[PDB]
Amino acid sequence: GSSGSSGSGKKPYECKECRKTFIQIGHLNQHKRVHTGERSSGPSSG
Ligand SMILES: [Zn+2]
């Protein structure tokens, strides 16, 4: 099951939704906001 190639060294930041990292705080400062809402839009949805 679990698996992961070699790498993924100490990462900078880490989102909460897409759990994505960011080299610079600026790129995240804006992204973080992008996660305003649009939640629970998977099942029984388009
Ligand atoms: Zn995100």
Side-chain angles (χ1 to χ4, degrees), residues 8-29:
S8 301
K10 199 193 163 80
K11 295 153 278 207
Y13 298 106
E14 52 183 72
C15 210
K16 278 87 200 270
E17 167 76 60
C18 66
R19 286 74 156 293
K20 202 182 199 158
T21 68
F22 301 80
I23 301 298
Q24 294 174 276
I25 179 63
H27 205 129
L28 173 63
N29 270 321

